[PDB]
């Protein structure tokens, strides 16, 4: 049925991040490829606010998510996070487009975009065109995922992983990106970007759900 796409903002003292990363790495390693329904597990910390970790999970469906949650490695991760995190916030997303390539210099960006209610459908189509062409044409684009907040359909979250800074620079200069920014001008009310330092990232190969 509908895939599960969640982002967990976990505020953890920079002093406790090594313990966090150990359990984050075990969670990733023991989940992929062992769990058939686990499509992506990863985590990155805000380059500007090192205490903020953004843990990203994608499952085939709710059932797959539950199977993951029942795993010992998932128990260990949540126990660890509950023990050390001063704040936690879970963002549940309705997946729109989820694209990945299979598997140091990686650039990871988390973008929150508020879209005007009247432009929901037009925006969705525009961003799908851009993401699909980027994944088909840019070898430096590793992961591109989009979803809308279940609690507010006009709030979009994007996760973009680029191979390096060069891939990022190229991405904004393509013909398809130019089209995207013209088409969506006036549809976007606000855009908040967090540049994350990748700590963990794994996927169950090349995924293309649009």
Using alpha carbons, select from 31, 92, 107, 109 the residue that is nearest to residue 64: 31
Is there a contact between 77 and 46 (Cβ–Cβ < 8 Å)? no
Domain housing 5? 1-210
Residue 94's CATH number = 3.30.70.100
Using alpha carbons, select from 194, 4, 167, 44 the residue that is nearest to residue 111: 194
Task: Give the whole-angstrom CA distance, residue 199 versus residue 115.
Answer: 30
Task: Give the whole-angstrom CA distance, residue 79 versus residue 134.
Answer: 38
Q: What angle do CA 170, 95, 100 make, to 5 degrees?
A: 40
Gyration radius of the chain over CA positions: 17
Task: Give the whole-angstrom CA distance, residue 187 versus residue 90.
Answer: 26
Task: Give the whole-angstrom CA distance, residue 108 versus residue 71.
Answer: 27
Instruction: DSSP for the chain, please give it.
Output: ---EEEEEEEEE-GGGHHHHHHHHHHHHHHHTTTSTTEEEEEEEEESS-TTEEEEEEEESSHHHHHHHHTSHHHHHHHHHHHHHEEEEEEEEEEEEEEEE------EEEEEEEEE-GGGHHHHHHHHHHHHHHHHHH-TTEEEEEEEEETTEEEEEEEEEEESSHHHHHHHTTSHHHHHHHHHTTTTEEEEEEEEEEEEEEEESS-EEE-
| Number of domains composing the chain | 1
Is there a contact between 205 and 98 (Cβ–Cβ < 8 Å)? no
* Burial of residue 31, with CB atoms counted within 10 A of its CB: 0-12 exposed, 13-18 middle, 19 or more buried: buried
- Resolution of the experimentally solved model in angstroms: 1.5
Is there a contact between 200 and 54 (Cβ–Cβ < 8 Å)? no
Task: Give the whole-angstrom CA distance, residue 194 versus residue 35.
Answer: 29
- What is the distance between the terminal CA atoms of the chain, rounded to a whole angstrom? 13
């Amino acid at each position: 049925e509908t895939p599960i796409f969640k982002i967990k903002k976990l505020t953890i003292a920079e002093n406790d991040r090594s313990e966090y990363i150990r359990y984050a790495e075990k969670n990733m390693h023991d989940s992929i490829p062992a769990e058939e329904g686990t499509l992506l597990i990863g985590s990155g910390h805000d380059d500007a606010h090192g205490e903020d970790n953004y843990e990203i999970e994608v499952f085939r469906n709710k059932g797959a998510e539950d199977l993951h949650i029942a795993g010992s490695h998932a128990d260990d991760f949540v126990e660890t996070v509950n023990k050390i995190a001063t704040k936690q916030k879970v963002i549940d997303l309705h997946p729109e487009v989820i694209t990945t390539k299979a598997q140091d210099n990686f650039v990871m960006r988390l973008i929150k975009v508020e879209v005007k209610d009247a432009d929901a459908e037009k925006f969705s189509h525009a961003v799908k065109k851009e993401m699909t062409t980027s994944m088909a044409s840019e070898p430096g684009m590793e992961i591109m995922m989009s979803g809308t907040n279940i609690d507010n359909p006009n709030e979009w979250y994007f996760i973009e992983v680029y191979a390096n800074d060069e891939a990022y620079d190229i991405h904004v200069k393509t013909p398809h990106y130019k089209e995207y920014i013209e088409e969506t001008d006036g549809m976007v009310k606000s855009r908040d970007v967090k540049t994350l330092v990748r700590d963990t990232l794994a996927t169950q190969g090349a995924i293309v759900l649009d």
